[PDB]
């Protein structure tokens, strides 16, 4: 219905604002098919305008899981960016899903790098499908509709390639849900459901795991990416 399409449209704006046109485009193509069967002129128009819309350093990975009523299992997408430029990509829809280089400078990382990145994506796929099922209960919404879960994580660096900000924030139905604070120690919860998540994650010390990544491996491999390009 229209409510499904508005959720898809909200996720487009989030995907656009987070810097991933690959998932923004898949999402708006979904919303555009739905709008043309429904026949809502304002929605149809909102699809076109988003269709129209489509030193310091940074690395971010934007991850997307999309549940549709004909999808026995959701699609899972992950696209990584260095200084706003795509360098790696995984899509659960490929005949052989795996991370693949999108930049020429990435083609000198060898086999062990790619198998482990792909292992991470296969675990993320299962994490997103479990969390989607959890959110459905939190909000008491019906499984038949469309639903999206989106994640952005990574780091910003100053002129000296030093950490200025680590980030790890989630969207559900294209709306802000939970976000790691700049202390990398506490969480901001954007609604009542997310307060259940925050409690859980505070109680199990989940922030610590993400802090270690953002301040360690994340900066460390961005440095190497920055010198390889």
């Amino acid at each position: 219905d229209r409510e499904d399409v508005e959720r898809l449209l909200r996720s487009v704006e989030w995907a656009i604002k987070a810097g991933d046109p690959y998932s923004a485009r898949i999402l708006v193509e979904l919303a555009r098919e739905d709008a043309e069967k429904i026949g809502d002129e304002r929605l149809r128009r909102e699809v076109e305008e988003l269709l129209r819309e489509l030193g310091p350093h940074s690395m971010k990975y934007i991850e997307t899981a999309i549940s549709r009523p004909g999808l026995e299992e959701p699609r899972y997408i992950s696209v990584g960016y260095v200084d706003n430029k795509e360098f790696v990509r995984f899509d659960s829809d490929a005949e052989n899903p795996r991370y693949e280089p999108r930049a020429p400078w990435m083609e000198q990382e060898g086999p062990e790098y790619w198998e482990r990145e792909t292992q991470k994506a296969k675990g993320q796929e299962q994490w997103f499908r479990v969390s989607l099922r959890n959110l459905l209960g939190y909000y008491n919404q019906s499984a038949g509709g469309s639903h999206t879960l989106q994640q952005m994580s990574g780091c910003d660096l100053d002129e000296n390639w030093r950490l200025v900000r680590g980030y790890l924030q989630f969207a559900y139905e294209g709306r802000d849900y939970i976000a790691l604070n700049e202390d990398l120690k506490t969480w901001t919860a954007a609604d009542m459901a997310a307060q259940i998540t925050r409690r859980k994650w505070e109680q199990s010390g989940a922030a610590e795991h993400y802090k270690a990544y953002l301040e360690g491996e994340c900066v460390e491999w961005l440095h190497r990416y920055l010198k390889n390009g």
């Binding site: 993320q124 994580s153 199990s204």
Partner: peptide
């Protein structure tokens, strides 16, 4: 290198 999540939502 990508992050990998721990506790589910």
């Amino acid at each position: 290198k990508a992050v990998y999540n721990f506790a589910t939502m």
